[PDB]
Amino acid sequence: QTPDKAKEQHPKLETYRCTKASGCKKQTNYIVADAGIHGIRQKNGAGCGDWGQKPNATACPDEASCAKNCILSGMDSNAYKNAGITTSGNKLRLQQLINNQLVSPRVYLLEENKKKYEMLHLTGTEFSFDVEMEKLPCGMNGALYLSEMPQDGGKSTSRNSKAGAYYGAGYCDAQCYVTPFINGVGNIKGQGVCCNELDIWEANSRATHIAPHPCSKPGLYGCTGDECGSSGICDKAGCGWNHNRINVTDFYGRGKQYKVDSTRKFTVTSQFVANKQGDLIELHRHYIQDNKVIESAVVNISGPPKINFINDKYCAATGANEYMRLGGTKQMGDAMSRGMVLAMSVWWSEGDFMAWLDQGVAGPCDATEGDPKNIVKVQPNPEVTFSNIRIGEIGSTSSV
Numbered sequence: 171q172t173p174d175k176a177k178e179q180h181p182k183l184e185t186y187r188c189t190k191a192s193g194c195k196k197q198t199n200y201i202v203a204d205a206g207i208h209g210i211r212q213k214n215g216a217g218c219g220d221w222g223q224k225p226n227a228t229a230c231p232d233e234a235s236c237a238k239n240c241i242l243s244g245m246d247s248n249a250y251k252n253a254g255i256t257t258s259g260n261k262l263r264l265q266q267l268i269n270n271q272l273v274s275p276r277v278y279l280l281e282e283n284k285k286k287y288e289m290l291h292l293t294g295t296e297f298s299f300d301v302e303m304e305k306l307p308c309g310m311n312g313a314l315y316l317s318e319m320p321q322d323g324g325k326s327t328s329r330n331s332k333a334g335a336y337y338g339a340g341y342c343d344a345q346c347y348v349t350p351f352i353n354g355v356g357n358i359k360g361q362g363v364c365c366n367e368l369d370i371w372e373a374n375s376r377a378t379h380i381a382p383h384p385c386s387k388p389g390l391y392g393c394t395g396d397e398c399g400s401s402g403i404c405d406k407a408g409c410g411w412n413h414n415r416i417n418v419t420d421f422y423g424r425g426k427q428y429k430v431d432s433t434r435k436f437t438v439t440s441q442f443v444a445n446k447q448g449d450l451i452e453l454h455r456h457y458i459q460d461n462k463v464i465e466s467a468v469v470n471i472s473g474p475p476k477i478n479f480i481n482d483k484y485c486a487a488t489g490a491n492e493y494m495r496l497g498g499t500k501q502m503g504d505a506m507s508r509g510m511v512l513a514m515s516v517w518w519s520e521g522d523f524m525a526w527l528d529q530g531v532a533g534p535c536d537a538t539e540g541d542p543k544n545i546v547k548v549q550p551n552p553e554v555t556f557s558n559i560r561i562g563e564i565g566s567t568s569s570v
C-alpha cells in the first residue's frame with residue numbers, strides 16, 4: 171500500500187544492552203503497529219483484502235495498481251492508544267479490547283531512527299524481559315517472539331513497496347499464512363508468507379510455551395502449493411517446551427502453589443547457546459521472581475532426555491519430526507544469526523480456543539472457558555505488559 175501524510179507517532183520504548191564487564195546501558199527504541207492495524211483502504215472505504223486471501227482483485231489486478239489504490243493511514247498517539255498500544259519508560263502495554271472493540275495488537279521493535287526494525291542476533295547471547303500475566307485467562311495468548319522479517323519492511327524488493335518498517339510492513343512467520351500483502355506489496359499470486367520464527371514466549375496466566383520453528387528458505391519466502399503445507403518449507407508445529415506437557419504441573423500458574431506465580435510480575439531469561447563453530451545447539455530458560463532465581467524443571471516423563479532445556483535430541487524424542495527434517499536447532503540458529511525482528515502481541519482464537527497452549531496435557535483449562543465469549547466473563551479487559559527488555563552477553567541481563 172501507499173501511506174497517507176498523517177503524522178506517525180510511535181510510542182517510545184526504552185530498552186537495554188548488557189555486558190558482563192559494564193552492566194546494562196539504556197537506549198531509546200520505538201514501537202510500530204503492524205501495517206494492517208494502521209488501516210489499509212481504498213478511496214471508497216472498502217478494505218484491500220482479508221487475512222487468508224489475495225488482495226481485492228479490482229483494487230489489485232497487479233502490483234502497481236495495488237500500491238496506487240490501497241492507502242495506509244498514519245497512526246498518531248491517539249491511534250496507538252485506540253489500537254490498545256501504549257508505553258511508559260521501559261513498559262509496553264498491550265490491550266485486547268478498547269471500548270468493546272476487538273483490537274488485538276501486534277507490534278514490532280524499531281531502531282531509534284525509526285526507518286529500520288531493530289534486528290536482533292541472538293545465537294550465542296541472552297535476552298531478558300519482565301512480564302505481567304495476571305489479566306490473561308484460559309484461551310488468551312500474550313506473545314513475545316521473533317520472525318525473519320526484512321529489516322526495511324520489504325522496500326528493496328520492489329519499486330511498488332513504500333510502507334517499510336516505519337509503517338510496520340513485511341510481516342512473516344512459520345505458519346506460511348496467505349496474507350493480502352507481502353513485503354509491502356499486493357500478494358497477487360496468493361502465496362503463503364513464510365519465514366523462520368522463534369517463539370520465546372507464548373502464554374496466559376494458566377500455561378506457557380516455548381517454540382523454535384525453523385524453515386528451509388532463508389528470510390521471507392512466498393510459498394506455493396505443497397511448499398505451504400505440513401510437508402513444506404516451514405515447521406508449523408515447532409519443537410515445543412511446556413512444563414505441563416513434560417508432566418511438571420506445579421511449575422507455572424496462578425498463586426502460591428506454583429514455583430512461578432503468574433498473578434504477580436516476574437522476569438523471563440532466555441539463553442541461546444552455541445558451539446565453537448557458532449551453531450546454536452541448545453535453548454535454556456530460567457525465571458526470577460521476588461529476587462530469587464527459579465530454574466526450569468527436568469523432563470518428568472519417560473522417553474526424552476532428562477534435561478530442562480531444548481536440543482535436537484529432546485526434539486526428536488518428543489516427536490518434532492518437521493523440525494528435524496528441516497534442519498533442526500542449527501537451522502533455527504542460522505536465521506537467529508542473520509538477524510530477526512522482535513514482535514509483541516495479544517490475541518485469542520475463535521476455532522481451537524488456544525487448546526494447544528492450555529488444555530489437556532498442556533494445562534488446566536476445560537474445553538470451553540477459552541472461547542472469547544467466556545474469556546470476557548472471566549476478565550472483561552484482558553491485557554498484558556512486557557517491560558525491561560535487556561539483550562546481551564549470557565550472564566549479564568538479569569541477576570539476583
Ligand SMILES: CCC(=O)OCC(O)(O)CCO[C@@H]1O[C@H](CO)[C@@H](O)[C@H](O)[C@H]1O
Binds near residue numbers: 275315317368515
Ligand atoms: C517464527 C515465529 C512464529 O511462527 O510466530 C508466530 C506465532 O507463533 O505467534 C503464530 C501466531 O501469531 C499470531 O497469529 C494470529 C493469527 O493466527 C495473529 O492475529 C497474532 O497477531 C499473531 O501474533
Ligand SMILES: *[C@@H]1O[C@H](CO)[C@@H](O)[C@H](O)[C@H]1NC(C)=O
Binds near residue numbers: 212214217226229
Ligand atoms: C473489492 O473491491 C471492490 C472495489 O472497490 C468492491 O466493489 C468489492 O466489493 C471488494 N470486495 C470486498 C470483499 O470487499
